Write a protein that binds this ligand. Structure first.
Ligand code: NI
Ligand code: NI
Lengths: 302, 306
């Protein structure tokens, strides 16, 4: 028992982290097979990040403009033999295939999904933590200068799913990056200019999962016979900055295990959003929306 | 910017996870140099875990009673050549040194310290998370049956400090294990009996660190001219289930960087413990005491003008 924010073991990803340098800019990259992926702003001098012309910056480069170093494990300088730009990423081709390339996929996560982040600096992994893609397609992580190129991933059945490459900090504690097709989460542009973030929302399905976790951890004071139907709840959610509830098998597994219906949990959300009134749930006095149904299922007795 | 619960990258520890089998019991273990460590209850049949006689169970074993296997990552061919019982651990000697042994040391953490946990099942690393040793020498983790042998560690300056090997669940969301000298944190026994946990306390120095992190993340509404001296605060803490505040260089770094004194933060704790008055700090409505001053400095300290 217990419920904690849990990340996927990072070793398979650590074996793929490299450092990339272009002029005076250095950041992290991901080395899979003969490819190294990194943010394209490595091409932009630090004092020109306000409105770069990446097409023009790309034309001025050659393969010799990029230096790649494997810093951890068996150290090696990897020779760049080709380069191209894919959205907000550079795709470098190196002469050596990573001998520790894991089985992997590239996926783009949807708002409400969780993933692990391996924070890196100068091609050295320094920390692991878990985030959720917010309703406005940002993440609430912990990143400092030099973290660009840090990798977000999940793991299942021995396969690493690479979902994020860190690109920038939008505002305090708010970050974004790209999927490995080079598309930025939230369509933010990789430039220093002020960019508006859309309004965020509480992820209903995740709050429901968390309330089921609370019941399975002996906290059930908030469960009442009271029900709110999904259609009615969804009309309320549209006015109270909550997401629409759409049923899933993972939630149905928790409803069946606990004997508490989804409609009872939706009624609990409405009551708890008005206030907890001097009470706590799993030590919290506010709703938690960053655990997914699958994340909760992983931490409950089978 | 931002402040999140951060764990040390786990790869160096993942390379050391093995499985040990004795009879019908298979547990996770840790392979370092020519040694494999695992919980001593591997010697106990599953239906006899209530109150085992470990001295009697040990006498019935030989080196051939134990099998060590590594079916994940780089596989290995291991033979047990010696065995002994060290507190609540079995210490096996194997014929092959782990070729991926990191530079390491063994340490016992004190209450208030944080560490990373690599949760393992069936010899497979499954999850990473960070805990703090509570005032009552328990941890508040997330573990299910089969997680014994899971490893707690820290990393700094290229050295892995191995601090914990998981053993048991004391009560809901409350766990304990041993350091690698085989001593159980909190002196709990590896038997299925009712065992009383001492009362916990909020770790003051960690709450102070968190409040400095909040200031460095733009949250400062709770800072007032009000101060509470350390001696006065400590007398209050003895009555309100908070730990004594003892000054440290890591906290002084945060006081200097923010210009907010420790005494202002101790006054904020007293006020916030009475209640947050409908406001939040870093998204929370309750005090956070599981980030140490050094953990905060990793996420917030930058260049300092001298
Ligand atoms: Ni950058
Ligand atoms: Ni066990």
């Amino acid at each position: 028992s217990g419920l904690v924010k849990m990340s996927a073991p990072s070793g398979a990803v650590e074996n793929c982290i490299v450092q990339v340098t272009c002029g005076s800019m250095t950041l992290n990259g991901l080395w899979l097979d003969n490819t190294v992926w990194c943010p394209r702003h490595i091409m932009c001098p630090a004092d020109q990040l306000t409105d770069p012309n990446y097409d023009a910056l790309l034309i001025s480069k050659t393969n010799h403009s990029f230096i790649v170093q494997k810093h951890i494990g068996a150290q090696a300088n990897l020779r760049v033999v080709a380069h191209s730009m894919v959205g907000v990423l550079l795709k470098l081709t190196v002469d050596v295939a990573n001998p520790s390339t894991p089985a992997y996929t590239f996926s783009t996560v949807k708002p409400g999904a969780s993933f692990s982040v391996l924070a890196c600096y100068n091609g050295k992994p320094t920390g692991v933590f878990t985030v959720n893609l917010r309703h406005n397609s940002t993440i609430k992580g912990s990143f400092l200068c030099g973290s660009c190129g840090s990798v977000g991933y999940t793991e299942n059945g021995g396969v690493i799913n690479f979902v994020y490459m860190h690109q920038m900090e939008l505002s305090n504690g708010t970050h974004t990056g790209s999927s490995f097709d080079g598309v930025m989460y939230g369509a933010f542009e990789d430039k220093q200019t002020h960019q508006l973030q859309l309004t965020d929302k509480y992820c209903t399905i995740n709050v429901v999962a968390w309330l089921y976790a609370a019941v399975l951890n002996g906290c059930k004071w908030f469960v009442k016979p009271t029900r709110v139907g999904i259609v009615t709840y969804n009309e309320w959610a549209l006015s109270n900055q909550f997401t629409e509830f759409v049923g899933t098998q993972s939630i149905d597994m928790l409803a069946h295990r606990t004997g508490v219906s989804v409609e009872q949990m939706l009624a609990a959300i409405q009551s708890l959003h008005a206030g907890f009134q001097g009470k706590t749930i799993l030590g919290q006095s506010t709703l938690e929306d960053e655990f997914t149904p699958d994340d909760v299922n992983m931490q409950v007795m089978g």
